Amino acid sequence: GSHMTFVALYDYESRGETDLSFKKGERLQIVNNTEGDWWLAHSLTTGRTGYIPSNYVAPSD
Ligand code: NI
């Protein structure tokens, strides 16, 4: 619900009111990773929240 950390593979610029912008390499906490194309996430560095495209991220190890 926040204990899964993913890393951005590519930069992403938000296009609407609900999606989260991020940079390649940024770490994102995933609230739920079972939801398909859009995952709800937040950055611990910027604090910002929003939906991210699930094809833009991989697990952060
Ligand atoms: Ni969690």
Swiss-Prot record:
Name of protein: Proto-oncogene tyrosine-protein kinase Src
Domain SH3 as annotated: residue spans: 5-61
Subcellular location, record wording: Cell membrane; Mitochondrion inner membrane; Endosome membrane; Nucleus
Organism: Gallus gallus (Chicken)
Quaternary structure (record): Forms a complex with polyoma virus middle T antigen. Interacts with AFAP-110. Interacts with GJA1 and PXN.
Known role: Non-receptor protein tyrosine kinase which is activated following engagement of many different classes of cellular receptors including immune response receptors, integrins and other adhesion receptors, receptor protein tyrosine kinases, G protein-coupled receptors as well as cytokine receptors. Participates in signaling pathways that control a diverse spectrum of biological activities including gene transcription, immune response, cell adhesion, cell cycle progression, apoptosis, migration, and transformation.
Section of the entire sequence shown: 85 to 141 of 533
Family: Belongs to the protein kinase superfamily. Tyr protein kinase family. SRC subfamily.
Modifications after synthesis and translation: The phosphorylated form is termed pp60c-src.
Gene encoding the protein: SRC
Tissue and organ expression note: Expressed to high levels, and with a high degree of kinase activity, in certain fully differentiated cells such as neurons, platelets and macrophages. Isoform 1 is widely expressed. Isoform 2 is expressed only in the muscle.
Top-level division of the source organism's lineage: Eukaryota
